[PDB]
Structure formats: structure tokens, C-alpha cells
């Protein structure tokens, strides 16, 4: 009684998937197992269905494989193997036995046949025995570092290439990044010879800086920066449409009158019944007191007491939603501390020079919260502490392992090159931010302590800052579209939660999701002295618990990222719409402003050149990116599931199409958040 096992072995399509390695197989059943069995005539190319007929013990009904690589001979150039899936039938079983991988085979690799089970689900022991010695190495190969106690924890890894190859860039995205790093280098260069000898003479100027970039179009607010509406309809649709809030009261540092305003108020009610009609709108960015710029300033509440040295500040800004439903910018304080020296300015200033000066504080104080607050440590940095528990916590059998893979990966292997080159020291930061030079770090540590998971559960942030109320704060289409997207996701999750997982008490066994949970809880976002909770749960207990966490997490890797990432074209590709650095510090008097003084505070022409290169850089899609719901890489075999995503992938072609309609009556289309221009992950 021996067994004909017929074999078709589908390898990955990704450059290096293939491989000249001797390949054996062992397979594993009921009765026994065979040996490890060749799979040798032919070879291994990437994107191949390969087929095998291989003859051996009868094993009876199979349970699970195991796949051997030699490591290649003195000339395999890398054999490192990655495997989409292996299809077996044996001759003396009436089943076709589906084994689902799309993981790196590197000598040795374990896979089951069939559906994602939960590790109390009824399987052979051999499965069980082999699962728990999977999370045993997982836990040896993922293990957490800090860069100090007040940040998320990281994976350990010294470079990229000492990370799990699972977790490394695929080499086209590596390609698209050095390649980036390339072209940028030799855009400044060019830019630099172009512009070398000249007169920075105007806000015109600059728009020569993006002119020999490839960016997708012209920055959309080139054209119109430098009108209040603009300005203003950029703290709803720009990169950081994140920190206003509806104002039920001025704050008592931010002295505001109807005196200051009545001017821009046009629907007939002065500031107070404005305020009550839930028209005005504020931010206040109190986070920036005490930051350290570049060249060593430090930002008082009141502000400050040839070299490269920079500012930033701590301003409040009022907007008024207008009768056309235009947000229009009407207050600005400089610093946090009212006074003659830290005045009120408005759209109104005697001198107009003032005004502009204005906004351009409110914009390096938003620029400096944006890029290190609200992109590189609420999206980068806090969600890896998810990736990396993903890998240490969950097995590749469990259903939860199957959804988040394909949305945790490359924020792992884009966070550990950036820690070199992003964050480090002389990095792009360094250049281009005025709280580049160190207190970049400290600032992220002092947002970090204030971070909690309920700030990444969109509809309940939206609520809390007052501005979820479309007949208020009309013409906000990232609240939108990534409410949409949101139900979308919560929708999707909540079937696949379903299938798996048939009650609370499920959840409460599953000992891989408590595990997953309580590592974030514990050594992710770890409350440390001086932190404020961090709303991780140490536990789960329900369905709709899970889906929650879940859905926040899925929805910021790829719909938050790319709303405050891929929007930095248009944010920042002119400069003066939104400046990262300025040169002197800010005036304690009214009527200083000129032309010439502002020219002279706004970034130098190289600054800004490298905002640019920055901003390429980071928003360049890999030629094999793959976006939201597309799932051509996931290891799913269960039918029902197969089914959730068919629905997902309709609801989302749907919310596409609403979005398209919708932008083709906007001045300026918003388009950051359709699904064919979101990746599934954070992975630039
Ligand atoms: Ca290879
Ligand atoms: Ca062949
Ligand atoms: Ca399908
Ligand atoms: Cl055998
Ligand atoms: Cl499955
Ligand atoms: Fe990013």
C-alpha cells in the first residue's frame, strides 16, 4: 500500500521568489508520514505552477506537509524560496488538499491543509505540537526594542537586511526607495545649478523648486496658497486635517473678541451666537511649547527671550465657516501666552505683510505637528507595535494572522530604514524640519505619552472634536470619505470575525488574541512614568471588542496613513503654502512685516528644496504597491471568507465610483482616499 502523491507547488510571482535549491517534501497523515520526498526535475521560477508525482507510504488522510531547502549549492545566487501554495491529491484520498503560504521558505517550512482555525479548534495533535513550536520561534526571530521609554516599541533589527525576510521590503519596493533616494539627489543637484545665482525676491520664486520633479501634477494649491479660503479649506482636505475642533468657548489664553472678528462674520450674528451656531472652529497647537529647533531655540508660552538656526511655535487659530460653507482663517496668536508682544492678528491687519507672517507661523507649527505627531508616530511607529505582536503572537494558521497580513506588511522594513535615515541624525528630518537637530525625538516622546487607541477610532475622534456635523462644517471630505471607508472596514472585519469566532466566549479562548493583545498592552504602548493611559486593552472580551481594534488598526495602516502621507504633494510641493522651517523668530510688535522680511524667515531656497526631495521621496507608490481590499497575495481558504472579501471589494468599488462623482463638481478634487490610490500597509 503505497501512496502516488501528485504535487503542484505555486511559487510567488516577486522578484527572488524563485530558486535552484534542492527541494524535498515530507507529508504527514492519520497513518504515518513518508520521507522527505524530491521534487527535482525542473525548475523553481517566480510566478511557476510547478507538478510533481512523488510515490511513498500511504499516509492516509494528509495533515500536514513539511517543505526542505538545501540552501542552494556553491552557485545558488539566492535560494530563498517564496511560496504562494502547495495543491496535493492523494491517490488513496477522494480530496484535493490546498496548503496556503506566501511566506519565505528559507530551509525549512510547516504548512496545514485548508481553513484558518483558532488554536482550540479540533485538529490532530501533530498540528497543535507544531503550531505552538511556530509562536515558539516567532518569539525567538520578533522581539521588541525601544528607542527610550516614551516611545511605542520597535522591532530589533540593526538594518533592513537583518530583518526576517517576511518582514523586508520585496525587492521592488526596495528598488522604488533607493531609486527615489537616487532620482532625488540628482533633482537637488539640477535644481541647485538652475537657481544657483538667484534673487529670492518673491512668494513666486519658489514654485521654480518643484518644476524638475515628477509629482503627479502641479501641487493643487500652487495656484491659490495665499487666499484665506484656500488656507482655510486646507485644515479640512490638506495633510493634517486632524487638530481642528468645533469651539464652544475662546480659550482664556486666546483673548478673541467680536471686536477682532465681526469684519469676517457675513451671516448676521456677532462671534458669540456664531459660536453657539457651531460655526467656529479652532486649533490649538499646546503641544509645541518647550520644543527644541535646530540650532537650539527653545519655545516658551510666550514665545522666544549666518548660523543654521530655526523657530517654531504654539499657535491658536480661529476659522469661521462662511455662508458659501467656506472655512475662512479669522484669528491667529502666535504663541500660547497673550500680550502686546503676542498679539491677535486677523485678515484685517493695517498691514497686510502681518497677516501673511501670521499664517506662515500657524503653517511651521502645523508642518512640524503634522510630519512627527500625526504622520511618522500615530500611523509609523504605534501601529509597528501591532505589526511586530501580529508576528510574535498570532500563527499563520489563525484567521486574524490571514487579515492583517497583508496590511501590517512594510511598516516594519520602512521604520527600520528609517531609523537610520528619517529620524536619525543628519537624516531628512534633520534638514528639513525646524525641529530637526534632536528635539524631533522629544517632541515625539511628548505626544507619545498623550497617545491613546481611541484616537484611531475614526467616527468616535470626529465626534469628540465637534466635527462630524456635515450642516456646520460643510465641504470636509476627508471626515467623508474616510467615514465610508471606516463602515467598509468595520463591515468586512466583523464577517470574518464571524466566521471563526461564533461568540464572546470564543474570543475569550482564543489564547493567541489575548496573547497579541496583552503584548501592545504590556511592551507596546507601554504606560511608562509620566504617561497617560494608552487605551490598550490587556484582554478581549467580545466579538464586537475585536472588531473595534481591529478596524482602527486595519483603517489607520492604510486609509489615516495615506490621508496624512500621500497628501504631502499637494500640501508641500510649494513651499509658502506650507512652511517646515523658519529662520528668525517671531515679531513682538505689529507693523514689521515686508516682503523682504518675510522672504528672509520663510525657508532658504535649499530648505525648501529639500521639503521636496523629502516629500518625493516618501510618497512614491511602489510599482508592485497593492491597494485597499486587494487581496491577491492573502492566504485565505475558507469559502464564507472568500465571500466577505467579494463584498468588501464590491462596497469599495462602490465607495470609488461615489467619490469620483463627487470630485467631478469640486474645485479641487479630493483624492487621497479612493481605494485604488490606498495601500494596503504603511510602507513609505
Ligand atoms: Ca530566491
Ligand atoms: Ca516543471
Ligand atoms: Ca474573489
Ligand atoms: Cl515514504
Ligand atoms: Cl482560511
Ligand atoms: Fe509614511
Redesign the pocket.
Known amino acids: 500500500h503505497h501512496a502516488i502523491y501528485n504535487v503542484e507547488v505555486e511559487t510567488g510571482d516577486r522578484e527572488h521568489a524563485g530558486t535552484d535549491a534542492t527541494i524535498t517534501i515530507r507529508i504527514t497523515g492519520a497513518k504515518g508520514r513518508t520521507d522527505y520526498l524530491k521534487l527535482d526535475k525542473g525548475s523553481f521560477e517566480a510566478g511557476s505552477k510547478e507538478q510533481y508525482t512523488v510515490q511513498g507510504f500511504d499516509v492516509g488522510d494528509i495533515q500536514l506537509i513539511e517543505l526542505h531547502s538545501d540552501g542552494g549549492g556553491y552557485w545558488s545566487g539566492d535560494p530563498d524560496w517564496f511560496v504562494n501554495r502547495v495543491i496535493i491529491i492523494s491517490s488513496t484520498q477522494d480530496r484535493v488538499y490546498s496548503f ?1 503560504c506566501f511566506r519565505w521558505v528559507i530551509k525549512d517550512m510547516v504548512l496545514f491543509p ?3 482555525t483558532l488554536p482550540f479548534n479540533e485538529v490532530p495533535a501533530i498540528v497543535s505540537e507544531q503550531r505552538q513550536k511556530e509562536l515558539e520561534q516567532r518569539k525567538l526571530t520578533y522581539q521588541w526594542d525601544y528607542v527610550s521609554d516614551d516611545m511605542p516599541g520597535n522591532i530589533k533589527a540593526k538594518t533592513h537586511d537583518d530583518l526576517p525576510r517576511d518582514v523586508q521590503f520585496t525587492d521592488e519596493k526596495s528598488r522604488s526607495y533607493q531609486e527615489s533616494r537616487k532620482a532625488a539627489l540628482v533633482n537637488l543637484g539640477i535644481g541647485s545649478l538652475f537657481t544657483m545665482f538667484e534673487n529670492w525676491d518673491s512668494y513666486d520664486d519658489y514654485h521654480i523648486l518643484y518644476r524638475n520633479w515628477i509629482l503627479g501634477g502641479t501641487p493643487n494649491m500652487a495656484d491659490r496658497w495665499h487666499e484665506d479660503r484656500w488656507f482655510g479649506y486646507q485644515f479640512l482636505n490638506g495633510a493634517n486635517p486632524v487638530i481642528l475642533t468645533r469651539c464652544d468657548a475662546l480659550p482664556s489664553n486666546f483673548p478673541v473678541t467680536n471686536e477682532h472678528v465681526n469684519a469676517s462674520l457675513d451671516r448676521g450674528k456677532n462671534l458669540d451666537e456664531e459660536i453657539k451656531d457651531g460655526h467656529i472652529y479652532i486649533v490649538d497647537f499646546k503641544v509645541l511649547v518647550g520644543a527644541k529647533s535646530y540650532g537650539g531655540p527653545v519655545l516658551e508660552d510666550i514665545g522666544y527671550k549666518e548660523a543654521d538656526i530655526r523657530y517654531c511655535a504654539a499657535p491658536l487659530a480661529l476659522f469661521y465657516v462662511n455662508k458659501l460653507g467656506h472655512l475662512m482663517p479669522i484669528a491667529i496668536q502666535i504663541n500660547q501666552e497673550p500680550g502686546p508682544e503676542n498679539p491677535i492678528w486677523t485678515p484685517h491687519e493695517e498691514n497686510e505683510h502681518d497677516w501673511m507672517m501670521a499664517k506662515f507661523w500657524l503653517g511651521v507649527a502645523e508642518s512640524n505637528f503634522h510630519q512627527l505627531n500625526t504622520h511618522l508616530l500615530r500611523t509609523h511607529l504605534t501601529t509597528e507595535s501591532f505589526a511586530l505582536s501580529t508576528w510574535r503572537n498570532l500563527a499563520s494558521a489563525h ?1 486574524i494572522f ?1 487579515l492583517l497580513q497583508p496590511h501590517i506588511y512594510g511598516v516594519l522594513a520602512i521604520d527600520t530604514i528609517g531609523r537610520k535615515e528619517l529620524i536619525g541624525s543628519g537624516g531628512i528630518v534633520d534638514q528639513s524640519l525646524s525641529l530637526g537637530g534632536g528635539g524631533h525625538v522629544t517632541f515625539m516622546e511628548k505626544c507619545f505619552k498623550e497617545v491613546n487607541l481611541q484616537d484611531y477610532h475614526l467616527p468616535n475622534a470626529l465626534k469628540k472634536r465637534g466635527v462630524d456635523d456635515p450642516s456646520k462644517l460643510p465641504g470636509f471630505y476627508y471626515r467623508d470619505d474616510g467615514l465610508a471607508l471606516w463602515e467598509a472596514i468595520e463591515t468586512f472585519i466583523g464577517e470574518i470575525i464571524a466566521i471563526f469566532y461564533k461568540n464572546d466566549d470564543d474570543v475569550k479562548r482564543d489564547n493567541e488574541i489575548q496573547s497579541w493583545i496583552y503584548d501592545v498592552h504590556k511592551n507596546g504602548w507601554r504606560v511608562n512614568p509620566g504617561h497617560q493611559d494608552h487605551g490598550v486593552p490587556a484582554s478581549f472580551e467580545s466579538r464586537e471588542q475585536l472588531k473595534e481594534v481591529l478596524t482602527s488598526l486595519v483603517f489607520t495602516f492604510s486609509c489615516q496613513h495615506a490621508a496624512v502621507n500621500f497628501s504631502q504633494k499637494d500640501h508641500y510641493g510649494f513651499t509658502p503654502n506650507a512652511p517646515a522651517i523658519l529662520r528668525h523668530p517671531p515679531p513682538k510688535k505689529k507693523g514689521e512685516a515686508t516682503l523682504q522680511s518675510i522672504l528672509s524667515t520663510l525657508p532658504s531656497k535649499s530648505q525648501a528644496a529639500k521639503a521636496i526631495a523629502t516629500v518625493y521621496i516618501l510618497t512614491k507608490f511602489s510599482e508592485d504597491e497593492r491597494y485597499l481590499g486587494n487581496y491577491s497575495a492573502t ?4 469559502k464564507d ?1 472568500l465571500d466577505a472579501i467579494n463584498r468588501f471589494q464590491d462596497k469599495l468599488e462602490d465607495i470609488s465610483k461615489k467619490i469620483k462623482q463627487r470630485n467631478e463638481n469640486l474645485e479641487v478634487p479630493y483624492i487621497y482616499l479612493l481605494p485604488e490610490r490606498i495601500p494596503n500597509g504603511t510602507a513609505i
Open positions: 496556503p485548508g481553513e484558518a484567521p490571514k492566504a485565505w481558504e475558507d471568507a
